[PDB]
Amino acid sequence: PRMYEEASGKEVEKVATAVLSTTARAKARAKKTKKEKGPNEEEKKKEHEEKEKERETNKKGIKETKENDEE
């Protein structure tokens, strides 16, 4: 079988989208915040380490490939 039980995931989907939508409402402020943010990370720590950020890690755009046994 496949999964067909669920009624606990409603919560997690709700707060998962809320945050991303908040980013859009917050944008006006966000850019001024962003100009500060970038240099402060390059000096200090990006988020704990600063390895591999040259592109977004080291790759850009789509990082996916097509399958040949599924669907």
Binding site: G9, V19, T22, R29, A30, T33
Partner: peptide, 26 residues
Amino acid sequence: GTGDVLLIQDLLHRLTPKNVKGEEDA
């Protein structure tokens, strides 16, 4: 004095007691 990150944070907190409970129930 630059807070708008702070705001979104103090709201994720609020939600969380309830939310975790939310996952299990379904």
